[PDB]
Design a protein around this ligand. Structure first.
Ligand SMILES: Nc1nc2c(ncn2[C@@H]2O[C@H](COP(=O)(O)OP(=O)(O)O)[C@@H](O)[C@H]2O)c(=O)[nH]1
Ligand SMILES: Nc1nc2c(ncn2[C@@H]2O[C@H](COP(=O)(O)OP(=O)(O)O)[C@@H](O)[C@H]2O)c(=O)[nH]1
Ligand SMILES: [Mg+2]
Ligand SMILES: [Mg+2]
Ligand SMILES: [Mg+2]
Ligand SMILES: [Mg+2]
Lengths: 205, 203
């Protein structure tokens, strides 16, 4: 097959407007775009949550077939989850000029006390593109899971994080059971379930 | 597993920062710390946009997947094109079931009737900044009936149906041609479960 039909040349962003600015922003995009049946749409407005973009690191120990998870409260999970404390991947915001890999390695140390060896890209995804611009770029990072323990996170920033080490099999079973249910961890761990055999061979050579 | 429960956090208040089609709320809360203490009062800005039902339309006889293409302007700044290849999906309104929304959107967005269904996974899109939860089902479809242009035109919805093989769709995930969370999650799940699913639905 061929894929998508239209490009950036087929949409005109007439205007953007920031409706709220605080730590994050809510922007109004005003645009018109080509229609599949020929013409151009009228003017359309969409509210878009703007919060920057993230680097995500799946810490995988290929010697032990183990993953390191970080636990912290995510209050937005409260209304639809039994607990707002989630088991997650290492992750942080990307600043201007920073690379995904530099952010991933720094956050692995800050959030889990982990040094990272080799890294490989997993996938880069849009979290929920009907309402937010956020893109997250996932790497897998080689770690020694026997070094992973304790409480981390930047305390001067109200970041309180607990490290957990589990087998890959257990982490994936938790995805299947819904005990791990945040997008970044689901995507990373499903990818690991599809790729771990080749990855362990590559990293223990 | 996790350490703390809802007994360990108090939401003191929520403040509406923005109310429009969607909302942005400030949650004010305190919570237990791993070191044994209580936090001070924490605030977080949270994007409130309701919750979604997502349908992976899978034809188990033909081993085919139905994708829908539509513009998502929020993708513009970080993507080659704002037109994305996606799963059928829609907002869940008050009192509706995930499955009822999935079936209605499959008809509106792809002209598809759905047979049997099975849950895939329900996930938080980005819980550091939004409450949004999306519940994915796989739905049995006849992909030969999936074609053409759909979407509710009276709602600025312009949608093109694409049919690909399962292996083709997954290759597109690997290559970055499909790169939205709902589709990546659904198609990775399908790559892990298709053998048993095809057997269940053809025998
Ligand atoms: N005015 C306005 N309407 C929106 C916005 N986002 C979604 N909608 C509405 O959602 C309907 C269909 O769009 P979509 O988001 O794909 O709905 P869904 O498929 O049920 O999730 C249309 O009627 C739009 O009016 C927005 O930012 N502004
Ligand atoms: N006060 C405040 N701080 C925020 C907000 N969003 C992010 N931060 C800060 O950004 C830092 C990293 O964000 P975090 O919550 O850890 O999300 P993550 O980077 O994706 O893991 C934290 O130290 C927070 O203090 C917010 O809405 N309000
Ligand atoms: Mg983080
Ligand atoms: Mg951090
Ligand atoms: Mg939709
Ligand atoms: Mg719809």
């Amino acid at each position: 097959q061929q894929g998508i039909t239209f490009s950036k040349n087929d949409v005109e962003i007439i205007a953007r407007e920031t409706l709220y600015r605080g730590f994050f922003s809510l922007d109004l995009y005003r645009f018109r775009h080509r229609l599949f049946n020929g013409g151009m749409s009228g003017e359309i407005t969409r509210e878009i949550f703007e919060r920057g973009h993230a680097a995500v690191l799946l810490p995988f120990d290929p010697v032990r077939d183990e993953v390191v998870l970080v636990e912290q409260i995510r209050i937005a999970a409260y209304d639809t989850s039994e607990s707002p404390w989630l088991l997650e991947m290492v992750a942080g915001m990307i600043e201007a000029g920073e690379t995904v890999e530099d952010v991933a390695r720094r956050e692995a140390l800050e959030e889990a006390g982990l040094e990272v060896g080799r890294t490989k890209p997993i996938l880069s995804y849009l979290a929920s593109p009907g309402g937010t611009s956020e893109r997250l770029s996932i790497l897998v990072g080689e770690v020694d899971a026997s070094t992973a323990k304790g409480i981390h996170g930047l305390a001067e920033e109200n970041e309180d994080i607990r490290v957990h080490v589990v087998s890959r099999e257990q982490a994936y079973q938790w995805v299947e059971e819904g005990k791990i249910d945040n997008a970044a961890s689901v995507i990373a761990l499903q990818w690991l379930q599809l790729h771990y055999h080749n990855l362990r061979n590559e990293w223990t050579k």
